[PDB]
């Protein structure tokens, strides 16, 4: 909706930031296991359910 409540706007703000590739310098960091962001979300595939 274009008329979204502030709660939903605030909580859709965070799921914006939650969707970015890992910083490249995470991969070179010692004793690391992070291979990619295994929690990405695409808007056509996974609906946030709210």
């Amino acid at each position: 909706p274009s008329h979204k409540t502030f709660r939903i706007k605030q909580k859709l703000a965070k799921k914006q930031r939650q969707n970015r590739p890992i910083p490249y310098w995470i991969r070179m960091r010692t004793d690391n296991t992070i291979r990619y962001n295994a929690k990405r979300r695409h808007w056509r595939r996974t609906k946030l359910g709210f």
Binding site: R7, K11, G49, F50
Partner: protein
């Protein structure tokens, strides 16, 4: 008909985010959260699903205050 023709009319939200638990389980028409039991005084919890109990028992969150209680027991609640 039932099925494909009828799944197109899912348009209105029966459940929305509860404020006590943040789950999408707040039945608006009935005004009660369907997981934490809000707005009941006590949290909805049942012994017929220990799996559901462990998902929200103590220790799954920050424990912003109880994490320090063992340290304060050690040395027996001292303040100078």
């Amino acid at each position: 008909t039932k099925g494909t023709g009828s799944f197109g009319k899912r348009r209105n939200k029966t459940h929305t985010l509860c404020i006590r638990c943040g789950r999408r389980s707040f039945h608006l028409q009935k005004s009660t959260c369907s997981s934490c039991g809000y707005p009941a005084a006590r949290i909805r919890k049942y012994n017929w699903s220990v799996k559901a109990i462990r998902r929200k028992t103590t220790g799954t969150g920050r424990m912003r205050y109880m994490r320090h209680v063992p340290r304060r027991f050690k040395s027996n609640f001292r303040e100078g």
